[PDB]
Design a protein around this ligand. Structure first.
Ligand SMILES: Cc1ccc2c(=O)c3cccc(CC(=O)O)c3oc2c1C
Ligand SMILES: Cc1ccc2c(=O)c3cccc(CC(=O)O)c3oc2c1C
Lengths: 178, 175
């Protein structure tokens, strides 16, 4: 199931959104004294926690600080027709210092995976959901690897949360640094 | 299968966002265009799903399906996806050379995904395989809509196969 879900995420969102990302950064930077930086901050980072319903990003971590919206993106495929999309820019702290600035969001298909799992008749366990989550990521990673213009503009950030000291900020930083 | 997750994502990712505000958007439409819609048959989101990828865009697919107007936009504002603006389009469906029906009409966006999947260099699949998937998608989507009345009565999945669409649409509006 998660195979077609990763494809619809790519086809139905990442394809529409990536190509104009850089231009929107350029603006953002004109208007915020070059807050985005070089290379690290030139990507759309998609968060995919493994372990449903992660904390929303404004509250998840005191070291992940919202700054501002990029300028909106207008789309006009023969969709759909006219659509407006938003993306959000976050300051990422390490040791009390601004260590990174980036565009960051959760993968919407989490919501579908969760909703699937919660359905009364055909819902399924946490373990079965994790198996699907892993399959979504593996499949999305493959798609992106095959598409250099897409891959140069975004990175899937996949992580597991221990219920048992987890900092999402340190995870994002490690990716941003790689 | 893959089309089952796809159906759930069209529902969770689009129909849930769009149907709740539809009637509000229709009423305002009617007021702006002399009650051009309302007849009950004129107040659902009609979603075309040709079982046959890449169906000609609606404005050009059939002389009997003629673009009239856009609904007022639907603004959405959730967590994660902050501001989005969605559009939907209203079509006049002529029969016998004359307007016979008016509706809100669009292609299901997941057609584009079953097609792209099909078309992949590796683990892509044939037309004969992509069709079985399209079938699974339609069935799964019609099962999902059934469990939630608020949604069901506000959209119809028009599924069709080459042996006139405008005649295929009116039948639905009439049902
Ligand atoms: C242009 C395009 C193409 C494919 C999809 C899609 O598979 C898909 C699957 C599930 C949910 C959506 C969201 C939507 O229809 O806006 C999807 O959007 C798509 C869009 C917007
Ligand atoms: C709110 C929400 C929830 C789930 C999905 C989704 O599964 C999903 C899967 C594939 C493609 C999209 C389109 C998008 O993220 O804009 C999807 O959108 C979703 C959206 C917008």
């Amino acid at each position: 199931v998660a195979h077609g879900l990763a494809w619809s995420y790519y086809i139905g969102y990442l394809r529409l959104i990536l190509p104009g990302l850089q231009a929107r950064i350029r603006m953002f930077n004109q208007l915020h004294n070059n807050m985005l930086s070089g290379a690290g901050s030139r990507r759309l980072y998609i968060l995919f926690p493994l372990d449903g319903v992660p904390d929303n990003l404004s509250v998840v971590d005191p070291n992940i600080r919202f700054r501002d919206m990029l300028p909106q993106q207008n789309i006009d495929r023969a969709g759909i027709k006219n659509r407006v999309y938003s993306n959000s820019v976050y300051e990422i702290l390490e040791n009390g210092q601004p260590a990174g600035v980036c565009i960051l969001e959760y993968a919407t298909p989490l919501q579908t995976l969760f909703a699937m799992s919660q359905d009364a008749k055909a819902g399924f366990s946490r373990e079965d959901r994790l198996e699907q989550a892993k399959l979504f990521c593996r499949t999305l990673e493959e798609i992106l690897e095959d598409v250099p213009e897409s891959r140069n503009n975004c990175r899937l950030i996949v992580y597991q949360e221990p219920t048992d000291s987890f900092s999402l900020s340190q995870e994002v930083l490690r990716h941003i640094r790689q």
